[PDB]
């Protein structure tokens, strides 16, 4: 069960055209290039997760 | 706190050149194209996780 | 193990008569119709969870 | 933080027309009526979760 | 896997002599009697967890 | 955030009269006396959890 | 499944030369000696986790 | 929230004298040297977790 784990978490607005993820913090607006990140993993067994969560359509605010 | 979550989990051998992930099950060897999967999210806020876990270098076996 | 997950979380005061869940936010009072939400899943395999948590009967506040 | 939690987990094939969830066990096929279950919570604050997970579209099995 | 779970969480200062647990909130000091709570479960299969966490002995402060 | 945690997990059939918990393993049938266990914590802030999970009333096996 | 767990969590700047971990709280600067802590476990089956998390190299701060 | 995580998990019999952890798998007996592992983190903010879990003292085996 012993193992070495290496993981990258990236949260932000995704633009696959320029292949970049950019998050709007409370101070700035950071931009990470998913391409470079992804490449660090090219050639190996990985576990990739892509989550997108939105709001629930309401039917009435009071 | 109510929300609608949509998530994709993909585990397998990653080849970013052809942009495909392929896992070796006990029964068959499935191949998913990360490109198509990724595109379903292009243009929205996301969390991407990319995990890669290996074994620990030993020094004694018996 | 690769898969596509789609999940809906709804937290609020439940009224099964009108089939609606409504949560009280420190800014407003949203109302979601559990019927419409539930219907998005009609006809498929699902894990459903319904939690209700209350307070513990005390034997002395101070 | 002390509290009393009461929760119901139901996993199966969902039919909202007859309002029943039915899971296929390697020993039998159980059927629960979501209506009765849901009613045990009518009139209270609740967190409800509805998950539906499917497979990932492949581009080549082998 | 479908099931009905019923759980009690109780956090506070424990006195087994009078069999009572009492927590000091920011607003008030609640007192729950572990005896009554425990009895609700007498006669059934359970999981009991009892956790106690303290601070780590330091050796340098600045 | 550094801390020392000490925790006890006890799963089995609960009998508060003789104050003992007894689990039926695959080999034997172990019996732990909740009294002794509980006492190790008498006099300190703790987080106690008592869970009891049962099966869901069915309406039809096929 | 019943068991007694004993666990130590230590978060801070690690210096293996003097074998000490030191975290910078919003108040003080605590220093724990990993040596003493580690010794409390010498001679036992353990599980050890060492995590180090950094920031993601950006390409566009704004 | 985006970040790079690097984590090591080590489970086995701990000997701090020789500074080695050794686990007994269902096949072999692997030995890892905690010293080398630990050094990979010397000089960094880390989180360290050391857990040791034992069995509960019974009062009636059967």
UniProtKB/Swiss-Prot annotation, chains A, B, C, D, E, F, G, H:
Domain of life of the native organism: Bacteria
InterPro entries named in the record: Phage_SP-beta_YonK (IPR018600), YonK_sf (IPR037261)
Alphabetized SUPFAM superfamilies for the sequence: YonK-like
Protein's gene: yonK
Protein name (database record): SPbeta prophage-derived uncharacterized protein YonK
Origin species: Bacillus subtilis (strain 168)
Summary of subunit composition and partner proteins: Octamer.
